[PDB]
């Protein structure tokens, strides 16, 4: 698999320090790993830094200079962006791209991202909540139940039922930022409501930020 | 951002759509453009590079041209799969950056109107007895993805402790969004339901729950 693995991201206090890293899979070595992109939630692409070779030099946004340093190493074909004096508005997810020159330049191939959080507000798990399947609301052969993903921060959290064994129904829902500042979800599945008295409903939620992981069963009434 | 595209564009299936791009000299002039295409919440993909090359899988009906300080994204028989924000870039040698239009999201039209589903879930037992109280609104498969919540505490109603998520389009194609009250014990335990209100299209579904004590 043709793929750019991103690390070194999270939650750091104003003022702090994160190393970013993009290591190259299924690709040899051709200078092109080279490019750093971000993100702020709702806003566009904007590039941040990137590095030339053979001869090592290291271009920069105005936004970031003297505070990022962007470095590889050649021989383990691993980018990296040294994050120093990390302020609020650098809060985005970070993206490195392949960049390459044939008549012009062009980032072919993109890492997943990794979400750099600036805030002084420390991690906290999700409180987690059953959705009881209704007496009433069962439509008929059908019953909704879920689980509520309460008051965590930062994202993102995982939801999986029955430890990955059920995938059919399920819709988790995309999180509402509370003014709060923390983040809630609900998962729901609907499933057969003659299942309900035998079969058994855990929604598996991981809060990788706060390491927290927290397995709440799901029964009527 | 530095180059200027037009926020939004829109066609029904199967037509055809274009998305212009504007620079300077130091930019677009000089510098070869490409065209990203960003599905919500994934990583951007490479459609278009030196100004009209396909990256290898594109297909044909993705086009690029540039002419002086302005490049063109055509993109023809429309599909609801081609529904992403598309972003132009290049390298200014004013500033020594890549630069990158603010985007443009292409909107398919003419897609079947449907009406939204709503379950309401009341206060869980387990967060009642942490002194808290939170209906859940749970509001999927509409179209358009545009739907306003109005929730009632018993007839009248409550704006207060509202929490909405901008609507999302589900992997159906259609659009999911969430709202949340957040109430007292004392309040949920005072009335004889509570009710969320969905609007769609001039038409309102409404679902209510009441304390089961
Ligand atoms: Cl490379």
């Known amino acids: 698999e043709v793929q750019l693995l991103e690390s070194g991201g999270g939650l750091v206090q104003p003022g702090g320090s994160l190393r970013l890293s993009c290591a190259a899979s299924?690709?040899?070595?051709?200078?092109?790993?080279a490019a750093w992109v971000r993100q702020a939630p709702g806003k566009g692409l904007e590039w941040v830094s990137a590095?030339?070779?053979?001869?090592?030099?290291?271009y920069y946004a105005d936004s970031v200079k003297g505070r990022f340093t962007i470095s590889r190493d050649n021989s383990k074909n691993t980018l990296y962006l040294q994050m120093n004096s990390l302020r609020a508005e650098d809060t985005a997810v970070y993206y490195c791209?392949?960049?390459?020159?044939?008549?012009?330049?062009?980032?072919?191939?993109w890492g997943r991202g990794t979400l750099v959080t600036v805030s002084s507000a420390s991690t906290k798990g999700p409180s987690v909540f059953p959705l009881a399947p209704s007496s009433k609301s069962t439509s008929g052969g059908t019953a909704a139940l879920g689980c509520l993903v309460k008051d965590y921060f930062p994202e993102p959290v995982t939801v999986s039922w029955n430890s990955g064994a059920l995938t059919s129904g399920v819709h988790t829902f995309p999180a509402v930022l509370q003014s709060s500042g923390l983040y809630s979800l609900s998962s729901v599945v609907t499933v057969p409501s003659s299942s309900l008295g035998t079969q058994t409903y855990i929604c598996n939620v991981n809060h990788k930020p706060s390491n927290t992981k927290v397995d709440k069963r799901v029964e009527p009434k | 951002s530095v180059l200027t595209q037009p926020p939004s564009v829109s066609a029904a299936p199967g037509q055809k759509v274009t998305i212009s791009c504007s620079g300077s000299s130091s930019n677009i002039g000089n510098h070869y453009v490409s065209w990203y295409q960003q599905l919500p919440g994934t990583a951007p993909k490479l459609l278009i590079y030196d100004n009209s090359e396909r990256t290898a899988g594109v297909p044909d009906r993705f086009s690029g041209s540039k002419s002086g300080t302005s490049a063109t994204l055509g993109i023809t028989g429309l599909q609801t799969g081609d529904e992403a924000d598309y972003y132009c870039?290049?390298?200014?040698?004013?500033?020594?950056?890549?630069?990158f239009g603010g985007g443009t999201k292409l909107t398919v039209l003419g897609q079947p109107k449907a009406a939204p589903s709503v379950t309401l879930f009341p206060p869980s037992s387990e967060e009642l007895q942490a002194n808290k109280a939170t209906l859940v609104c749970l509001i999927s498969d509409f179209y358009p993805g545009a739907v306003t919540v109005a929730w009632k505490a018993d007839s009248s109603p409550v704006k207060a402790g509202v929490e909405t998520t901008t609507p999302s389009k589900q992997s159906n194609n259609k659009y999911a969004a969430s709202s949340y009250l957040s109430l007292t014990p004392e309040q949920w335990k005072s009335h004889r339901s509570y009710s969320c209100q969905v609007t769609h299209e001039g038409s309102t579904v409404e679902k209510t729950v009441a304390p089961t004590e």
């Open positions: 299924g690709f040899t070595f051709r200078y092109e790993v």
């Open positions: 791209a392949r960049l390459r020159a044939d008549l012009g330049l062009y980032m072919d191939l």
């Open positions: 870039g290049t390298w200014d040698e004013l500033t020594s950056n890549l630069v």
């Open positions: 590095i030339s070779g053979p001869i090592p030099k290291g």
